[PDB]
């Protein structure tokens, strides 16, 4: 959803 984490 866009997070790289």
């Amino acid at each position: 959803n866009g997070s790289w984490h």
């Epitope: 959803n1 866009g2 997070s3 790289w4 984490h5």
Partner: antibody, heavy 121, light 108 residues
């Protein structure tokens, strides 16, 4: 169609600064993490930096941490890489890439054309 | 720092099967993807999540990731498959990690 068009590059002196940019279209830009990947002449691919979709989190390879800054403008659909304190070791073809992340699965599905950065006096 | 091992070169006869390997300790426990890079060109994703082919990639390309090695196989190798192939994964010690790349040479 997905497009990533890179700008910037060329010659820069050791210790100098250079900014690359990546213009995106054909997808919801803010929904994707983005990254910079580089390749020294005749060498392999090396991940450089990433930024989350929102711009809230940035990540850097140990080789560039503290010298580079990644940022993005979600209204203009542009990603930036400000490179400072450049070294001969940073000479490479740089690519911007769209990342798909599910932290276990990370991959780059679309890539820009590369731009060559030469660090020389 | 976590490392991915690829042989720098692999030779295959035209029309034969190429098996490009990528090894790493926890490899079978991780998700691996593959890129094809033709000389002086932008890399192209050819395989993701070990075995999934992006749209437009020929069925001749197949991926597997079992045990300590991830393998990209190419059947009926064509001159159009001549390229450098890179495997890539993730690890906590390096974030995104690439293999050194394997140059596929076609024997004629």
């Amino acid at each position: 169609e997905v497009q990533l068009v890179q700008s910037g590059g060329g010659l820069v002196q050791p210790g100098g600064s250079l900014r690359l940019s990546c213009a995106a279209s054909g997808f919801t830009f803010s929904s994707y993490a983005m990254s910079w990947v580089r390749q020294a002449p005749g060498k392999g691919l090396e991940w450089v930096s990433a930024i989350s979709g929102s711009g809230g989190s940035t990540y850097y390879a140990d080789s560039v941490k503290g010298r580079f800054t990644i940022s993005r403008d979600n209204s203009k659909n542009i990603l930036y890489l400000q490179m400072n304190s450049l070294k001969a070791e940073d000479t490479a073809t740089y690519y911007c890439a769209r990342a798909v992340v599910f932290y276990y699965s990370k991959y780059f599905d679309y890539w820009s054309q590369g731009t060559l950065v030469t660090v020389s006096s | 720092s976590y490392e991915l091992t690829q042989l720098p070169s692999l030779s295959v006869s035209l029309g034969q099967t190429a098996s490009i390997t990528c090894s790493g300790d926890n490899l079978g426990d991780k998700f691996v993807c593959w890129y094809q890079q033709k000389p002086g060109q932008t890399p192209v994703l050819v395989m993701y999540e070990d075995t999934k082919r992006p749209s437009g990639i020929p069925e001749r390309f197949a991926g597997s990731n079992s045990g300590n090695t991830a393998t990209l196989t190419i059947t009926g190798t064509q001159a159009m498959d001549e390229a450098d192939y890179y495997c890539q994964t993730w690890d906590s010690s390096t974030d995104v990690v690439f293999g050194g790349g394997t140059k596929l040479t076609v024997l004629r």
